């Protein structure tokens, strides 16, 4: 899953920053605008790699105000989830509708009726849990989830998964 994609970005530098430590200010701007960002297109952009050799190229000067626009060619580590992708993470929240597992920078949600049947919801617990003949899932338990579907949204991706198939559930 986790990928390393070759991306690029455009930055418009005011003329004031047309100093000597310019390359530095761009490389900075890049990281400010990219690391932490999210798109359904490339998923979560987590970390820009090889800081040292970020290609700045020659920026062209806009022609009415005097800013320049550089096309910063970088490379980075991204995280885009998928439907049918098996992933395991830790629990975070848990109600009567299901519980939310956290895989990486993202959060997956397991709906009650997407769990096995013999697995019940013990409300009269704390932290709230889900009990089975054998299992006891809750707040911090690690779980192996199958991502059933994703929903790209704003600055993040969210999905819903099940643990009703085989070899899925707590670990």
């Amino acid at each position: 899953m986790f990928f390393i994609k070759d991306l690029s970005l455009n930055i418009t530098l005011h003329p004031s920053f047309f100093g000597p430590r310019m390359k530095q200010y761009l490389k900075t701007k890049l990281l400010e605008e990219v690391e932490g960002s999210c798109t359904g297109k490339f998923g979560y952009i987590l970390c820009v790699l090889d800081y040292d050799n970020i290609d700045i190229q020659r920026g062209r000067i806009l022609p009415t105000d005097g800013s320049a626009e550089f096309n910063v060619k970088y490379r980075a580590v991204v995280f885009k989830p998928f439907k049918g992708e098996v992933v395991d993470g830790t629990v975070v929240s848990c109600s009567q509708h299901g519980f939310e597992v956290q895989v990486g920078p993202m959060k997956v949600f397991v709906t009650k009726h997407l769990m096995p049947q013999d697995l019940t919801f013990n409300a009269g617990s704390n932290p709230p849990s889900y009990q089975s003949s054998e299992d006891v899932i809750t707040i911090k338990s690690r779980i192996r989830v199958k991502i059933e579907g994703c929903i790209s949204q704003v600055s993040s991706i969210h999905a819903i998964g099940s643990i009703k198939e085989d070899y899925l559930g707590a670990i």
């Binding site: 000067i61 105000d65 005097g66």
Partner: protein, 87 residues
């Protein structure tokens, strides 16, 4: 494509700077000098942006590059440094 970037060698365009090029350099620099960008010469008391630009150009200290386009899309880059300034 950048398969359109004609090497510093093999350049065939004029070695000299065109009135248009230069008119546009002095103007661009003046603009940025007025935008409070860094100035690369000593303002011998100069305080007019175009003046400061003409001065930067006379001391070939203008960090700009003219990207000349050929009718096909090819292009040769020339620095104001390089470019002669007979005009």
């Amino acid at each position: 494509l950048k398969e359109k970037a004609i090497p510093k060698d093999q350049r065939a365009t004029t070695p000299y700077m065109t009135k248009y090029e230069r008119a546009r350099i002095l103007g661009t620099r003046a603009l940025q000098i007025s935008m409070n960008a860094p100035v690369f010469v000593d303002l011998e008391g100069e305080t007019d942006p175009l003046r400061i630009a003409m001065k930067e150009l006379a001391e070939k200290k203008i960090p700009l590059v003219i990207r000349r386009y050929l009718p096909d899309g090819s292009f040769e880059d020339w620095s104001v440094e390089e470019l002669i300034v007979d005009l």
